[PDB]
């Protein structure tokens, strides 16, 4: 779905406990890029530091966008997680 204006806001996580929460568009190109940017040969599945997604949205407007991040610069890996988990949860956007 991603690749296609709307910022998109995903959250990485490695097992070093690394919240990586970006937002961007066509992210699978900007991924696959820094992977195969700093150095690399030819390792797709990628092993070495591991990356979960368990954070996914994306934003239209900029406001609700400078407030994710606003608000994700103050809470943590913690308040983050819960702060979507409230809303993964739950299903209720679009429509009625």
Do not use: W
């Given at each position: 779905?991603?690749?296609?204006?709307?910022?998109?806001?995903?959250?990485?996580?490695?097992?070093?406990?690394?919240?990586?929460?970006?937002?961007?568009?066509?992210?699978?190109?900007?991924?696959?890029?820094?992977?195969?940017?700093?150095?690399?040969?030819?390792?797709?599945?990628?092993?070495?530091?591991?990356?979960?997604?368990?954070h996914t949205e994306k934003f239209?407007?900029r406001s609700e966008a400078t407030?994710?991040?606003?608000?994700?610069?103050?809470?943590?890996?913690?308040?983050?997680?819960?702060?979507?988990?409230?809303?993964?949860?739950?299903?209720?956007?679009?429509?009625?």
């Amino acid at each position: 779905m991603e690749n296609k204006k709307s910022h998109y806001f995903y959250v990485l996580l490695c097992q070093d406990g690394s919240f990586y929460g970006g937002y961007t568009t066509e992210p699978e190109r900007r991924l696959t890029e820094h992977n195969s940017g700093t150095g690399a040969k030819y390792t797709r599945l990628a092993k070495r530091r591991p990356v979960i997604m368990i954070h996914t949205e994306k934003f239209e407007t900029r406001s609700e966008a400078t407030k994710a991040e606003a608000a994700f610069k103050k809470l943590t890996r913690k308040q983050k997680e819960q702060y979507l988990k409230t809303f993964h949860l739950e299903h209720h956007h679009h429509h009625h």
